[PDB]
């Protein structure tokens, strides 16, 4: 799926190179590559900042006011963990493959069995897959991902991530959440309370104020987490606190971290496509880039009718083409390969 | 054994002393052990005297080399409460010590207790002003490394551009004292070589010259480090006062011993 | 180097990570927090394509996965009787990190 | 910042909103000349006591 995104952008660059070759037959290889790379980078920035971020954080960056040469845009250590966990909490156990005509095909497993979706834990670092052999299979994967609803933004992780993440050493499987916690400890990440204080958020003094909705229900994850920390809220780490804060959206800590990181990335970048001082694009070109969405890129590289995809592929709403057959779960999918 | 990482997970040991002094001590102890092994081969009743001579010679040599490489010339030590690190208002109680040698200054910061603020405070940093070495560059590298505040303060006190001129005078004193000590070591080598030769008078005069050069190194260090204007070293609520350290007195006693030995050798030759 | 919103939090204050017993075991914490039923749909109806596009964006932005030199290991002690990594109750299972 | 600058530039700094760790405060090369000349243009020939 990450490979499918990479293939999507590779094909988009090739398509833009072909377009520029048609527009300028006299241009050499270097000029065509540079213009295509410039356009693709601008499109990637626009989609990542103005389309994916508002849909996945429920927060919108402030209107662009110019380039800030004195603003440090370096990625913060907290942003790594925040973004990684806020994305890993939504990883589905399986991924649908969808046809252009709203048909969900069967996925052939390496066992030669036919399942309804591609199992995530059995596709890690896949050199080859029986149902992934041509470009049309990549297009089907992209369409299925566009039509499939992701997991809930909560503290629960699927077993493909929690138990069957690729083990980098001596083990074929590992715990991705435990690895991320050990990474945050390795990177010297601050505590949850100190992280909130540094961002100007309201201090949290009781364990049940971390997520009032979570404590409202019968879920006892807050009490058990407090017991693990010996009821010491000052020792709660940034990653568990951010995981517990999420409810229908990333928690205020994670949302603030990602929002400020992207604001600094956009404002601190001299090569941002909206920065008119770099001379990368004209006003009309900037408007064209702003009008471009990921649906446009998918339509362009898949060579598909625009009506086959919703205008905002990041969110599926009622009435959008090709509803998913059902919300995917572990049931009906191939068992994860033992460690 | 494998299957786990790392194979050797134990803490990595730290050498418990200065490596140059340890090497000098090891070499001279090996020479002494060889001489003690061959001692019964020394025929007659001379061996006792021989033993004394050998020991004396070795000691002298070792002392010179050690005194040339030890940072124990101007020593001082205080016990204070001081700020420890940046982005932290916590203070540490520690012994802060200055050890100015010929080729540089060693700043020691030993916590009392060593384990304070969940950190191990046993710093012993070196800042060298030897010819070809840039003290300002070393201080800048220390600043970039993030050394504790007392260490940075005492290092900046010895920077070339610091208001109090400790850097220039101490560098001059250490350089010429080291030169005189190297001359004394060469004279010691020549005295050892020539004492085996039939002319014992020249060996005695060379030993006297070794003592004279040691005393001259002492005098030059004292005169060059005394001409400095008073530089107040204030840490926390206390003031660091420096004084001639063990290296100075070791040089004094070794030079006096060499001078007396050469004088006695010359007098005994004249009388006999 | 990466930026820091808060000064680095280390056991020794320089590079040694905070861990047990001051912090709970990573595997115990992961089992306590992240264990739950799969199949819970996103409350905002966000798509999987969005999740993996965000993963691609993260790969574009930051990468702190490859180990550094010299090789330092912060091993995750698997609690005895873990259903996934220590099913035999050996009590010495260690996930290398 | 709040007394000399408003009186000598006729401009007031915006209300303080907090510390910015990611903002570079280093003195610019242009600021040296700008401040030096905007002050030197007002130096009197003499000073009263």
């Amino acid at each position: 799926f990450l490979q499918a995104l990479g293939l999507l952008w590779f094909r988009y660059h090739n398509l833009w190179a072909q377009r520029l070759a048609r527009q300028h037959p006299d241009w050499e290889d270097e000029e065509l590559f540079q213009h295509a790379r410039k356009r693709v980078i601008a499109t990637y920035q626009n989609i990542a900042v103005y389309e994916w971020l508002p849909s996945f954080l429920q927060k919108t960056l402030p209107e662009y006011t110019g380039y800030r040469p004195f603003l440090d845009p370096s990625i913060s250590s907290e942003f790594v963990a925040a973004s990684e966990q806020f994305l890993s909490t939504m990883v589905p156990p399986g991924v649908y493959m969808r046809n252009a005509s709203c048909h969900f095909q069967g996925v052939i497993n390496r066992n030669s069995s036919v399942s309804r979706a591609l199992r995530v834990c059995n596709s890690y670092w896949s050199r080859e897959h029986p149902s992934l052999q041509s470009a049309e299979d990549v297009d089907a994967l992209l369409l299925g991902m566009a039509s499939q609803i992701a997991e809930r933004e909560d503290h629960v992780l699927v077993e493909d991530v929690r138990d069957f993440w690729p083990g980098p050493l001596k083990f074929s499987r590992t715990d991705h959440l435990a690895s991320c916690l050990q990474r945050g400890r390795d990177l010297g990440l601050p505590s949850y309370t100190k992280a909130r204080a540094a961002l100007g958020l309201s201090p949290i003094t009781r364990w049940q104020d971390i997520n009032p909705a979570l404590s409202r229900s019968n879920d006892t994850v807050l009490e058990a987490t407090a017991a693990l920390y010996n009821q010491d809220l000052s020792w709660l780490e940034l990653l568990p606190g951010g995981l517990l804060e999420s409810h229908r959206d990333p928690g205020p800590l994670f949302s603030t971290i990602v929002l400020e990181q992207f604001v600094r990335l956009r404002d601190g970048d001299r090569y941002w496509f909206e920065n008119t001082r770099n001379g990368l694009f004209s006003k009309k070109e900037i408007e064209e880039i702003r009008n471009t969405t990921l649906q446009d890129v998918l339509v362009a590289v898949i060579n598909i009718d625009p009506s086959a995809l919703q205008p905002n592929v990041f969110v599926w709403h009622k009435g959008d083409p090709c509803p998913q057959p059902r919300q995917l779960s572990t049931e009906g999918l191939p068992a994860c390969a033992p460690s | 054994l494998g299957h786990t990482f790392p194979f050797y997970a134990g803490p990595k040991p730290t050498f418990p002393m200065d490596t140059t002094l340890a090497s000098i001590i090891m070499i001279f102890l090996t020479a002494l052990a060889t001489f003690i092994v061959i001692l019964p081969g020394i025929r007659g009743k001379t061996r006792l005297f021989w033993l004394l001579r050998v020991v004396t010679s070795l000691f002298i040599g070792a002392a010179i080399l050690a005194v040339n490489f030890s940072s124990e010339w101007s020593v001082g030590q205080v016990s204070t409460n001081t700020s420890y690190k940046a982005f932290s208002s916590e203070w540490i109680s520690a012994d802060i010590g200055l050890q100015v040698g010929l080729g540089g200054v060693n700043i020691t910061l030993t916590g009392t207790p060593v384990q304070q603020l969940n950190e191990t405070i046993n710093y012993n940093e070196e800042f060298t002003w030897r010819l070809g070495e840039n003290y300002a560059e070393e201080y800048a590298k220390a600043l970039e490394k993030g050394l504790p505040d007392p260490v940075l303060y005492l290092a900046e006190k010895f920077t070339p551009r610091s208001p109090c001129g400790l850097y220039r005078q101490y560098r001059l004193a250490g350089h010429y004292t080291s030169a005189m000590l190297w001359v004394a070591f060469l004279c010691w080598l020549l005295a050892n070589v020539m004492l085996s030769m039939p002319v014992l008078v020249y060996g005695g005069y060379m030993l006297l010259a070794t003592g004279i050069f040691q005393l001259l190194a002492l005098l030059f260090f004292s005169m060059a480090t005394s001409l400095t204007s008073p530089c107040p070293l204030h840490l926390g609520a206390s003031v660091l006062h420096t004084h001639h350290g063990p290296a100075f007195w070791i040089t004094l006693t070794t030079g006096l011993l060499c001078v007396l030995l050469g004088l006695a050798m010359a007098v005994a030759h004249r009388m006999q | 180097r990466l930026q820091r919103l808060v000064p680095a939090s280390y056991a020794d204050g320089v590079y040694q990570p905070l861990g047990e017993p001051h912090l709970p075991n990573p595997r115990d914490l992961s089992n306590t927090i992240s264990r739950g039923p799969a199949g819970l749909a996103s409350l905002r109806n966000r798509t999987v394509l969005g999740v993996f596009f965000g993963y691609h964006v993260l790969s574009d932005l930051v990468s702190v996965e490859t180990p550094g030199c010299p090789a330092e290991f912060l091993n995750i002690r698997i609690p005895p009787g873990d259903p996934m990594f220590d099913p035999d109750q050996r009590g010495d299972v260690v996930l290398p990190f | 910042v709040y007394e000399w600058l408003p009186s000598f530039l006729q401009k007031t700094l915006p209300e303080y909103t907090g510390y910015r760790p990611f903002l570079d405060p280093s003195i610019s090369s242009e600021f040296v000349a700008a401040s030096e000349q905007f002050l030197s243009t007002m130096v009197p020939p003499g000073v009263y006591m």
Partner: peptide, 28 residues
């Protein structure tokens, strides 16, 4: 208690910024 309850500002301007220690420092 210690009367100096805050982190004393350095005279050389070092370590004023958390990640850019040379910002505003002497010689920068």
């Amino acid at each position: 208690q210690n009367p100096i309850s805050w982190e004393v500002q350095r005279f050389d301007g070092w370590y004023n910024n958390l990640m850019e220690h040379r910002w505003g420092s002497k010689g920068s």
